[PDB]
Amino acid sequence: EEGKLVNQCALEFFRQIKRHCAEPFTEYWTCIDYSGLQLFRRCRKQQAQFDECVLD
C-alpha cells in the first residue's frame, strides 16, 4: 500500500522537469548514455547547464 504511493510520486517528479527546463535535462541525458558507466566523469561540464535552470 505504501509502495503504491512510491510509483505515483515517481511520476510527479519527472513531470515537473518535463514542464520547466527540459533543454538542460535532455542534453544531460545524452551525455550519460554516450559514455559507458562513468556517471559523473567527463560530463561535469554539461552538468553546469543543469541545476542552474532548476535553481530558479
Partner: protein
C-alpha cells in the same frame, strides 16, 4: 730514381688512450632525482584517489536514492 713506400706517422694515432669516463650520473645526485620522483609520484597519485572519493560516495548515493528500483 728509386720510388718505394714512404713513411708517414703525423699524429701517431695516440697509443692507448682512455675513452671510458663518468658521464651524466655522479652518485648522490641520482638518488635525489630517483627518490625525488617517488615522493612526487605518491603525492600526485593520492590526490586523484581523494578526487575518486568524491565520485565514490556519489555513485553509492544513487542506489540509496532509488527505492522504486
Amino acid at each position: 730514381x728509386x720510388x718505394x713506400x714512404x713513411x708517414x706517422x703525423x699524429x701517431x694515432x695516440x697509443x692507448x688512450x682512455x675513452x671510458x669516463x663518468x658521464x651524466x650520473x655522479x652518485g648522490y645526485s641520482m638518488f635525489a632525482v630517483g627518490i625525488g620522483a617517488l615522493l612526487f609520484g605518491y603525492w600526485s597519485m593520492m590526490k586523484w584517489n581523494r578526487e575518486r572519493r568524491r565520485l565514490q560516495i556519489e555513485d553509492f548515493e544513487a542506489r540509496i536514492a532509488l527505492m522504486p528500483l
